[PDB]
Amino acid sequence: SMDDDQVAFSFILDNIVTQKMMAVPDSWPFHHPVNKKFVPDYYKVIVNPMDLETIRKNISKHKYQSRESFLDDVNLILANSVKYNGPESQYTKTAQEIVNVCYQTLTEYDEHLTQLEKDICTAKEAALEEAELESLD
């Protein structure tokens, strides 16, 4: 079903986060949301915060239905570090390594992720057609 596909898709993404992204050396700043007590202006500067725990919560709620949607939140971790810390910061260098490891692992599982993403979308569209047909009475 679409539900089994959603589960298989989210399982692969979660393993990318936990086995690859969270394992990047010195990735500790990125495993949780920034604590505003320690960085009081963070959420004034950064409009769309993102971190690896939040990505995992999003995966568990099946927010991501495409490789692109996932990568977009992953890219946000890096973009936010560029904005807050600058390109030359160690924070930014580490965030880039996290993004790179994500791309390399997506590459590795691309065939299966691509077929799941297609199958999920097709099932979703078919359910919507069914609902629209039922609205038409």
Ligand SMILES: Cc1cc2c(cc1N1C(=O)c3cccc4c(CCCO)ccc(c34)C1=O)n(C)c(=O)n2C
């Ligand atoms: C202080 C800081 C500055 C940052 C930053 C992240 C952090 N920061 C940690 O490094 C950090 C390390 C380890 C544990 C943490 C927990 C644990 C919560 C559950 O027990 C919560 C919050 C933080 C951390 C955290 O806010 N980022 C991404 C930046 O760009 N700056 C400038």
